[PDB]
């Protein structure tokens, strides 16, 4: 664990446990570097990283503000969030999968209507996949992301990019179960057929059923 | 424009114009600081910021990689994206509003079912609003974000947080039109009535119609 890593983790934990409460000004840099035990330049790089992720707000000639991350942070904090509240992780994971399922009903339908060639290309990558957890987790994430971009609206893609960290961490655990891998292959294959048939109005129900059934398998593993 | 601001903007522009192509290694720090004209510590803080936003990948003892931001960046780059490709902005804006509309059909319905008290509280803030662009832009963003969190699934909220920058910039221009302000007040009021009535299945069509009609007003302003 680098001096920077140690400092970033210390400050985030200190915000979470209210040593540095959201809504207040962060202690002076000299005070902080002395408390954490890192150089002022290490601290500055760390504060820059945290600011960019939303934990803090830095202003040219004003004190640094500790933010409530729920107002200023994006999908980027998801893994950190999982790590800080180990007890709420199950809920957080259910929320993420629910977002994946519901927002995908939108972009998968749009991709089938706007760029079916691209959607087919993305879905066809399922034919190669190695039969194991890490390979499926990658595959699954790439298909949802690939379909998001295939909608022709890249903003859905930026959303999947932010979900990646926690999403693939769930996948690596989820796809250790053989049934999870099988239900997913069945899903990608059915998606391709719906795309081929132009069965746009059937995408919603097919994706919702996959969300629910893969959700049942996961809840049982949790 | 600070030395750091200048450097960050230079590197991002250089990636966009392929002086530093995505998929390649970034020039050595001494070389970069000399070219840009900033100190090594300014450069390091800047590289840390860019890495956190996805433009680059930094590894303890390996060269820095220039990323294709479409794979590694999140909703955070939206404004930067608008600034880099002035010609595609119209499309980008249409895509963002479309995402707002379609994903909100999901979280607004969920908020009305799970936390109608909170949804009502959020919607009631429309009663105070000052009759002008900046106030409505803020209001409108706060209502969509407020409803996203009111769904009980905070991940929808993190998504709105990432949309904020570009979303409110569009709003500040959009709500300069009196009709835009009026159609929105009508929308918040109708949303409250649907919430009150438990008319969950009517949320989809009401939000889609608002998306389309506010979209028509905007396209006409563009």
UniProtKB/Swiss-Prot annotation, chains A, B:
Enumerate the transmembrane spans: none
Q: Which compartments is it annotated to reside in?
A: Cytoplasm
Q: Which GO terms describe its biological process?
A: fatty acid metabolic process; regulation of fatty acid metabolic process
Gene Ontology molecular function terms on file? DNA binding; DNA-binding transcription factor activity; fatty-acyl-CoA binding
* Gene Ontology CC: cytoplasm
Q: Which InterPro entries match?
A: FA-response_TF_FadR, FadR_C, TF_FadR/GntR_C, Tscrpt_reg_HTH_GntR, WH-like_DNA-bd_sf, WH_DNA-bd_sf
- Indicate where this protein is primarily found: cytoplasm
Instruction: Report the Pfam families cross-referenced here.
Output: FadR_C (PF07840), GntR (PF00392)
Domain (HTH gntR-type) spans 1-69
The record places the DNA-binding region at 29-48
Subunit-structure text: Homodimer.
Q: Which HAMAP family match?
A: HTH_FadR
Protein name from the UniProt record:
Fatty acid metabolism regulator protein
Organism listed in the record:
Shigella flexneri
* Origin organism lineage: Bacteria, Pseudomonadati, Pseudomonadota, Gammaproteobacteria, Enterobacterales
